[PDB]
Amino acid sequence: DELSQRLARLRDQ
Amino acid sequence: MAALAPLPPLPAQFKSIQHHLRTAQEHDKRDPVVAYYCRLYAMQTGMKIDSKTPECRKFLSKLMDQLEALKKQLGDNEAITQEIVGCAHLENYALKMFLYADNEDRAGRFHKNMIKSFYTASLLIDVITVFGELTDENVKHRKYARWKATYIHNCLKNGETP
């Protein structure tokens, strides 16, 4: 979930 | 980010993204856009498989470190800011390798380059799922390419002609 958020931030959304 | 910057050992459960990660490393200087999306596919596949076992969460965290590092490096590159441009980039490159390997195949020239180009083309089609669902044509080229690669490889490995 810390991961899930880094991903969402990574993919600019 | 260093050339061949090491991740921790690959969890056994992530064995299916091993070659996507290798492809990423092999493109880290030649084509950082391909290297980036290859890692993105591996991240995203890894999460779905197992994102709660500790070893895996460690691996995934280190992989996101390289993604974030590489997003930084790429900046305002359109292939990153616009998904569809990234998709076209990977798709054109996959097709380029596939048409290369296919031409070799039709000429009866069987060798490591044509084998690797087939298999990488199929690895790139896997990666293209980060842009959305595969098309029927994606699916057929992927299966075709995986088949030729492992088949031609195993023939040559055993001194047989394909």
Coordinates of N, CA and C in Angstrom, one line a residue:
Chain A
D1 N 0.8 -1.2 0.0 CA 0.0 0.0 0.0 C 0.9 1.3 0.0
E2 N 2.0 1.2 0.7 CA 3.0 2.3 0.5 C 3.5 2.1 -0.9
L3 N 3.6 0.9 -1.3 CA 4.0 0.6 -2.7 C 2.9 1.0 -3.7
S4 N 1.7 0.7 -3.4 CA 0.6 1.1 -4.3 C 0.5 2.6 -4.6
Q5 N 0.9 3.4 -3.5 CA 0.8 4.8 -3.7 C 2.0 5.4 -4.5
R6 N 3.2 4.8 -4.2 CA 4.3 5.2 -5.0 C 4.1 4.9 -6.5
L7 N 3.4 3.8 -6.8 CA 3.1 3.4 -8.2 C 2.1 4.5 -8.8
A8 N 1.1 4.8 -8.1 CA 0.1 5.8 -8.6 C 0.8 7.1 -8.8
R9 N 1.7 7.5 -7.9 CA 2.5 8.7 -8.1 C 3.5 8.6 -9.2
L10 N 4.1 7.4 -9.4 CA 5.0 7.2 -10.4 C 4.3 7.4 -11.8
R11 N 3.1 6.9 -11.9 CA 2.4 6.9 -13.2 C 1.5 8.2 -13.3
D12 N 1.9 9.2 -12.6 CA 1.4 10.6 -12.7 C -0.2 10.6 -12.8
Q13 N -0.8 10.2 -11.7 CA -2.2 10.1 -11.6 C -2.7 10.4 -10.2
Chain B
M1 N 21.6 6.5 -12.0 CA 21.5 5.1 -11.7 C 22.7 4.3 -12.4
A2 N 23.4 3.5 -11.7 CA 24.5 2.8 -12.3 C 24.1 1.8 -13.3
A3 N 24.9 1.6 -14.4 CA 24.7 0.4 -15.2 C 24.7 -0.8 -14.4
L4 N 23.8 -1.7 -14.6 CA 23.7 -3.0 -13.9 C 23.5 -2.8 -12.4
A5 N 22.9 -1.7 -11.9 CA 22.6 -1.5 -10.5 C 21.8 -2.7 -10.0
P6 N 22.3 -3.4 -9.0 CA 21.7 -4.6 -8.5 C 20.5 -4.5 -7.6
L7 N 19.5 -5.3 -7.9 CA 18.4 -5.5 -7.0 C 18.7 -6.6 -6.0
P8 N 18.0 -6.7 -4.9 CA 18.2 -7.9 -4.1 C 17.9 -9.2 -4.9
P9 N 18.2 -10.4 -4.4 CA 17.9 -11.6 -5.2 C 16.4 -11.7 -5.6
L10 N 16.1 -12.2 -6.7 CA 14.8 -12.3 -7.2 C 14.0 -13.4 -6.5
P11 N 12.9 -13.0 -5.8 CA 12.1 -14.0 -5.1 C 11.7 -15.1 -6.1
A12 N 11.6 -16.4 -5.7 CA 11.3 -17.5 -6.5 C 9.9 -17.4 -7.2
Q13 N 9.0 -16.8 -6.4 CA 7.7 -16.4 -6.9 C 7.6 -15.4 -8.0
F14 N 8.7 -14.6 -8.1 CA 8.8 -13.6 -9.2 C 9.6 -14.2 -10.4
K15 N 9.8 -15.5 -10.5 CA 10.6 -16.1 -11.6 C 10.0 -15.7 -13.0
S16 N 8.7 -15.5 -13.1 CA 8.1 -15.1 -14.4 C 8.5 -13.7 -14.9
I17 N 9.0 -12.8 -14.1 CA 9.4 -11.5 -14.6 C 10.9 -11.4 -14.8
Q18 N 11.7 -12.5 -14.5 CA 13.1 -12.4 -14.6 C 13.7 -11.9 -15.9
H19 N 13.1 -12.3 -17.0 CA 13.6 -11.9 -18.3 C 13.2 -10.5 -18.7
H20 N 12.1 -10.0 -18.1 CA 11.6 -8.6 -18.4 C 12.6 -7.7 -17.7
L21 N 13.1 -8.1 -16.5 CA 14.1 -7.3 -15.8 C 15.4 -7.3 -16.5
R22 N 15.8 -8.5 -17.0 CA 17.0 -8.6 -17.8 C 17.0 -7.6 -19.0
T23 N 15.8 -7.6 -19.7 CA 15.6 -6.8 -20.8 C 15.8 -5.3 -20.5
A24 N 15.2 -5.0 -19.3 CA 15.3 -3.6 -18.8 C 16.8 -3.2 -18.6
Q25 N 17.6 -4.0 -17.9 CA 19.0 -3.8 -17.7 C 19.8 -3.7 -19.0
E26 N 19.5 -4.6 -20.0 CA 20.2 -4.5 -21.2 C 19.8 -3.3 -22.0
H27 N 18.7 -2.6 -21.7 CA 18.4 -1.3 -22.4 C 18.6 -0.1 -21.6
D28 N 19.2 -0.2 -20.4 CA 19.4 1.0 -19.5 C 20.1 2.2 -20.2
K29 N 21.1 1.9 -21.1 CA 21.7 3.0 -21.8 C 21.1 3.2 -23.2
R30 N 20.9 2.1 -23.9 CA 20.5 2.1 -25.2 C 19.1 2.8 -25.4
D31 N 18.2 2.4 -24.5 CA 16.8 2.9 -24.6 C 16.1 2.9 -23.2
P32 N 16.4 3.9 -22.4 CA 15.8 4.1 -21.1 C 14.3 4.1 -21.1
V33 N 13.6 4.4 -22.2 CA 12.2 4.3 -22.2 C 11.7 2.8 -22.1
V34 N 12.4 2.0 -22.9 CA 12.1 0.6 -22.9 C 12.5 0.0 -21.5
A35 N 13.6 0.5 -21.0 CA 14.1 0.0 -19.7 C 13.1 0.3 -18.6
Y36 N 12.5 1.6 -18.7 CA 11.6 2.0 -17.7 C 10.3 1.2 -17.8
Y37 N 9.7 1.0 -19.0 CA 8.4 0.3 -19.0 C 8.6 -1.2 -18.7
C38 N 9.8 -1.8 -19.0 CA 10.1 -3.2 -18.6 C 10.1 -3.3 -17.1
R39 N 10.7 -2.4 -16.4 CA 10.6 -2.4 -15.0 C 9.2 -2.1 -14.5
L40 N 8.4 -1.3 -15.1 CA 7.1 -1.0 -14.7 C 6.2 -2.2 -14.8
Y41 N 6.3 -2.9 -15.9 CA 5.6 -4.2 -16.1 C 6.0 -5.2 -14.9
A42 N 7.3 -5.2 -14.6 CA 7.7 -6.2 -13.6 C 7.2 -5.8 -12.2
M43 N 7.3 -4.5 -11.9 CA 6.7 -4.0 -10.7 C 5.2 -4.4 -10.5
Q44 N 4.5 -4.1 -11.6 CA 3.0 -4.2 -11.6 C 2.6 -5.7 -11.6
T45 N 3.4 -6.5 -12.2 CA 3.2 -8.0 -12.2 C 3.5 -8.5 -10.8
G46 N 4.6 -8.0 -10.2 CA 5.1 -8.5 -8.9 C 4.1 -8.2 -7.8
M47 N 3.5 -7.0 -7.8 CA 2.5 -6.6 -6.9 C 1.3 -7.6 -6.9
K48 N 0.7 -7.9 -8.1 CA -0.4 -8.8 -8.2 C -0.1 -10.2 -7.7
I49 N 1.1 -10.7 -7.9 CA 1.5 -12.0 -7.5 C 1.6 -12.2 -6.0
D50 N 2.4 -11.3 -5.4 CA 2.6 -11.3 -4.0 C 3.2 -10.0 -3.5
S51 N 2.4 -9.2 -2.8 CA 2.9 -7.9 -2.3 C 2.8 -7.9 -0.8
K52 N 2.8 -9.0 -0.1 CA 2.7 -9.1 1.3 C 3.8 -9.9 2.0
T53 N 4.3 -11.0 1.4 CA 5.5 -11.6 1.9 C 6.6 -10.6 1.9
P54 N 7.4 -10.6 3.0 CA 8.4 -9.6 3.3 C 9.5 -9.5 2.2
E55 N 10.1 -10.6 1.9 CA 11.2 -10.6 0.8 C 10.7 -9.9 -0.4
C56 N 9.5 -10.2 -0.8 CA 8.9 -9.6 -2.0 C 8.7 -8.1 -1.9
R57 N 8.2 -7.7 -0.7 CA 8.0 -6.3 -0.5 C 9.3 -5.5 -0.5
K58 N 10.4 -6.2 0.0 CA 11.7 -5.6 -0.1 C 12.1 -5.4 -1.5
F59 N 12.0 -6.5 -2.3 CA 12.4 -6.5 -3.7 C 11.6 -5.4 -4.4
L60 N 10.3 -5.4 -4.3 CA 9.4 -4.5 -4.9 C 9.8 -3.0 -4.6
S61 N 10.2 -2.8 -3.3 CA 10.6 -1.4 -2.9 C 11.8 -0.9 -3.6
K62 N 12.8 -1.8 -3.7 CA 14.1 -1.5 -4.4 C 13.8 -1.3 -5.9
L63 N 12.9 -2.1 -6.5 CA 12.5 -1.9 -7.9 C 11.9 -0.6 -8.1
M64 N 10.9 -0.2 -7.2 CA 10.3 1.1 -7.3 C 11.4 2.3 -7.2
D65 N 12.5 2.0 -6.4 CA 13.6 3.0 -6.3 C 14.2 3.2 -7.7
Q66 N 14.4 2.2 -8.5 CA 15.0 2.3 -9.8 C 14.0 3.0 -10.7
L67 N 12.7 2.7 -10.6 CA 11.6 3.3 -11.4 C 11.6 4.8 -11.2
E68 N 11.5 5.2 -9.9 CA 11.5 6.6 -9.5 C 12.8 7.3 -10.0
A69 N 13.9 6.6 -9.8 CA 15.2 7.2 -10.3 C 15.1 7.5 -11.8
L70 N 14.6 6.5 -12.5 CA 14.6 6.5 -14.0 C 13.5 7.5 -14.5
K71 N 12.4 7.6 -13.8 CA 11.4 8.6 -14.2 C 12.0 10.0 -14.0
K72 N 12.8 10.2 -13.0 CA 13.6 11.5 -12.8 C 14.5 11.7 -13.9
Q73 N 15.3 10.8 -14.3 CA 16.2 10.9 -15.4 C 15.5 11.2 -16.7
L74 N 14.3 10.6 -16.9 CA 13.6 10.8 -18.2 C 12.9 12.1 -18.3
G75 N 12.5 12.7 -17.2 CA 11.9 14.0 -17.2 C 10.7 14.1 -18.1
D76 N 10.7 15.2 -19.0 CA 9.6 15.5 -19.8 C 9.6 14.8 -21.2
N77 N 10.2 13.6 -21.2 CA 10.2 12.7 -22.3 C 8.8 12.3 -22.6
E78 N 8.3 12.6 -23.8 CA 6.9 12.4 -24.2 C 6.4 11.0 -24.1
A79 N 7.3 10.0 -24.3 CA 7.0 8.6 -24.2 C 6.6 8.2 -22.8
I80 N 7.0 9.0 -21.9 CA 6.7 8.8 -20.5 C 5.4 9.6 -20.0
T81 N 5.4 10.8 -20.4 CA 4.3 11.7 -20.0 C 3.0 11.3 -20.7
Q82 N 3.1 10.9 -22.0 CA 2.0 10.4 -22.8 C 2.0 8.8 -23.0
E83 N 1.1 8.1 -22.3 CA 1.2 6.6 -22.4 C 1.2 6.1 -23.8
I84 N 0.3 6.7 -24.6 CA 0.1 6.1 -25.9 C 1.4 6.3 -26.8
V85 N 2.2 7.3 -26.5 CA 3.5 7.5 -27.2 C 4.5 6.4 -26.7
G86 N 4.5 6.2 -25.4 CA 5.2 5.0 -24.9 C 4.8 3.7 -25.5
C87 N 3.5 3.6 -25.7 CA 3.0 2.3 -26.3 C 3.4 2.2 -27.7
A88 N 3.3 3.2 -28.5 CA 3.8 3.2 -29.9 C 5.3 2.9 -29.9
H89 N 6.0 3.5 -29.0 CA 7.5 3.2 -29.0 C 7.8 1.8 -28.8
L90 N 7.2 1.1 -27.8 CA 7.4 -0.3 -27.5 C 6.9 -1.2 -28.6
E91 N 5.7 -0.9 -29.0 CA 5.1 -1.6 -30.1 C 5.9 -1.6 -31.4
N92 N 6.4 -0.4 -31.8 CA 7.2 -0.3 -33.0 C 8.5 -1.1 -32.9
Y93 N 9.1 -1.1 -31.7 CA 10.3 -1.8 -31.4 C 10.1 -3.3 -31.4
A94 N 9.0 -3.7 -30.7 CA 8.7 -5.2 -30.8 C 8.5 -5.7 -32.2
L95 N 7.8 -4.9 -33.0 CA 7.5 -5.3 -34.4 C 8.8 -5.3 -35.3
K96 N 9.7 -4.3 -35.1 CA 11.0 -4.3 -35.6 C 11.8 -5.6 -35.3
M97 N 11.8 -6.0 -34.1 CA 12.6 -7.3 -33.8 C 11.9 -8.5 -34.4
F98 N 10.6 -8.5 -34.3 CA 9.8 -9.6 -34.8 C 10.0 -9.8 -36.4
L99 N 9.9 -8.6 -37.1 CA 10.1 -8.7 -38.5 C 11.6 -9.1 -38.8
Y100 N 12.5 -8.5 -38.0 CA 13.9 -9.0 -38.2 C 14.0 -10.5 -38.1
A101 N 13.5 -11.1 -36.9 CA 13.7 -12.5 -36.7 C 12.9 -13.4 -37.7
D102 N 11.8 -12.9 -38.1 CA 10.9 -13.6 -39.1 C 11.6 -13.7 -40.4
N103 N 12.3 -12.6 -40.8 CA 13.0 -12.6 -42.1 C 14.2 -13.6 -42.1
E104 N 14.9 -13.7 -40.9 CA 15.9 -14.7 -40.7 C 15.3 -16.1 -40.9
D105 N 14.2 -16.3 -40.2 CA 13.5 -17.5 -40.2 C 13.1 -18.0 -41.6
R106 N 12.5 -17.1 -42.3 CA 12.2 -17.4 -43.7 C 13.4 -17.8 -44.6
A107 N 14.5 -17.2 -44.2 CA 15.7 -17.5 -45.0 C 16.5 -18.7 -44.6
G108 N 16.0 -19.4 -43.5 CA 16.7 -20.5 -43.0 C 17.9 -20.2 -42.2
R109 N 18.1 -19.0 -41.9 CA 19.2 -18.5 -41.0 C 18.8 -18.6 -39.6
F110 N 19.4 -19.6 -38.9 CA 19.0 -19.9 -37.5 C 20.2 -19.6 -36.6
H111 N 20.0 -18.7 -35.6 CA 21.2 -18.2 -34.8 C 20.7 -17.4 -33.5
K112 N 21.6 -17.2 -32.6 CA 21.3 -16.5 -31.4 C 20.6 -15.2 -31.5
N113 N 21.0 -14.4 -32.5 CA 20.3 -13.1 -32.6 C 18.9 -13.2 -33.0
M114 N 18.5 -14.1 -33.9 CA 17.2 -14.2 -34.4 C 16.3 -14.8 -33.3
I115 N 17.0 -15.6 -32.4 CA 16.2 -16.3 -31.3 C 15.9 -15.3 -30.3
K116 N 16.9 -14.5 -29.9 CA 16.8 -13.5 -28.9 C 15.8 -12.4 -29.4
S117 N 15.8 -12.1 -30.6 CA 14.9 -11.1 -31.2 C 13.4 -11.6 -31.2
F118 N 13.2 -12.8 -31.5 CA 11.9 -13.4 -31.3 C 11.5 -13.3 -29.8
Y119 N 12.3 -13.8 -28.9 CA 11.9 -13.9 -27.5 C 11.7 -12.5 -26.9
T120 N 12.6 -11.5 -27.2 CA 12.5 -10.2 -26.7 C 11.2 -9.5 -27.3
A121 N 10.9 -9.7 -28.5 CA 9.7 -9.2 -29.1 C 8.5 -9.7 -28.2
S122 N 8.5 -11.0 -27.8 CA 7.4 -11.5 -27.0 C 7.4 -10.9 -25.6
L123 N 8.6 -10.7 -25.1 CA 8.7 -10.0 -23.8 C 8.2 -8.5 -23.8
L124 N 8.5 -7.8 -24.9 CA 7.9 -6.5 -25.1 C 6.4 -6.5 -25.2
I125 N 5.8 -7.5 -25.9 CA 4.3 -7.6 -25.9 C 3.8 -7.8 -24.5
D126 N 4.4 -8.6 -23.7 CA 4.0 -8.7 -22.2 C 4.0 -7.3 -21.6
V127 N 5.1 -6.6 -21.8 CA 5.3 -5.2 -21.2 C 4.1 -4.3 -21.6
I128 N 3.7 -4.4 -22.9 CA 2.7 -3.6 -23.4 C 1.3 -3.7 -22.7
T129 N 1.1 -4.8 -21.9 CA -0.1 -4.8 -21.1 C -0.2 -3.7 -20.1
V130 N 0.9 -3.0 -19.8 CA 0.8 -1.8 -18.8 C 0.0 -0.7 -19.5
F131 N -0.1 -0.7 -20.8 CA -0.9 0.3 -21.5 C -2.3 0.0 -21.7
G132 N -2.7 -1.3 -21.4 CA -4.0 -1.8 -21.5 C -4.0 -3.2 -22.0
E133 N -5.2 -3.7 -22.3 CA -5.3 -5.1 -22.7 C -4.7 -5.4 -24.0
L134 N -4.1 -6.6 -24.2 CA -3.5 -7.0 -25.5 C -4.6 -7.1 -26.5
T135 N -4.2 -6.8 -27.8 CA -5.1 -7.0 -28.9 C -4.9 -8.5 -29.3
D136 N -5.8 -9.0 -30.2 CA -5.7 -10.3 -30.7 C -4.4 -10.5 -31.4
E137 N -4.0 -9.5 -32.2 CA -2.8 -9.5 -32.9 C -1.5 -9.6 -32.0
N138 N -1.6 -8.8 -30.9 CA -0.5 -8.8 -29.9 C -0.4 -10.3 -29.4
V139 N -1.5 -10.9 -29.0 CA -1.5 -12.2 -28.5 C -1.0 -13.3 -29.5
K140 N -1.3 -13.2 -30.7 CA -0.8 -14.1 -31.7 C 0.7 -13.9 -32.0
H141 N 1.2 -12.7 -32.1 CA 2.6 -12.4 -32.3 C 3.4 -12.9 -31.1
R142 N 2.9 -12.7 -29.9 CA 3.6 -13.1 -28.7 C 3.7 -14.7 -28.7
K143 N 2.6 -15.4 -28.9 CA 2.7 -16.8 -28.9 C 3.6 -17.4 -30.0
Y144 N 3.5 -16.8 -31.2 CA 4.3 -17.2 -32.4 C 5.8 -17.0 -32.0
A145 N 6.1 -15.9 -31.5 CA 7.5 -15.5 -31.2 C 8.1 -16.4 -30.1
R146 N 7.3 -16.6 -29.0 CA 7.8 -17.5 -28.0 C 8.0 -18.9 -28.5
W147 N 7.1 -19.3 -29.4 CA 7.3 -20.7 -29.9 C 8.5 -20.8 -30.8
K148 N 8.7 -19.9 -31.8 CA 9.9 -20.0 -32.6 C 11.2 -19.9 -31.8
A149 N 11.2 -19.0 -30.8 CA 12.4 -18.9 -30.0 C 12.8 -20.1 -29.2
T150 N 11.8 -20.7 -28.4 CA 12.2 -21.8 -27.6 C 12.4 -23.0 -28.5
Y151 N 11.6 -23.1 -29.6 CA 11.8 -24.3 -30.5 C 13.1 -24.3 -31.3
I152 N 13.4 -23.2 -31.9 CA 14.7 -23.0 -32.6 C 15.8 -23.2 -31.7
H153 N 15.8 -22.6 -30.6 CA 16.8 -22.7 -29.5 C 17.0 -24.2 -29.1
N154 N 15.9 -24.9 -28.8 CA 16.1 -26.3 -28.4 C 16.6 -27.2 -29.5
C155 N 16.2 -26.9 -30.7 CA 16.8 -27.7 -31.8 C 18.3 -27.5 -31.9
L156 N 18.7 -26.2 -32.0 CA 20.2 -26.0 -32.1 C 20.9 -26.5 -30.9
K157 N 20.3 -26.4 -29.7 CA 20.9 -26.9 -28.5 C 21.2 -28.4 -28.6
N158 N 20.4 -29.1 -29.3 CA 20.5 -30.6 -29.5 C 21.0 -31.0 -30.8
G159 N 21.6 -30.1 -31.5 CA 22.2 -30.3 -32.8 C 21.3 -30.7 -33.9
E160 N 20.0 -30.4 -33.7 CA 19.0 -30.6 -34.8 C 18.7 -29.4 -35.5
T161 N 18.3 -29.5 -36.8 CA 17.8 -28.4 -37.6 C 16.3 -28.2 -37.3
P162 N 15.9 -26.9 -37.2 CA 14.5 -26.6 -36.9 C 13.6 -26.9 -38.2

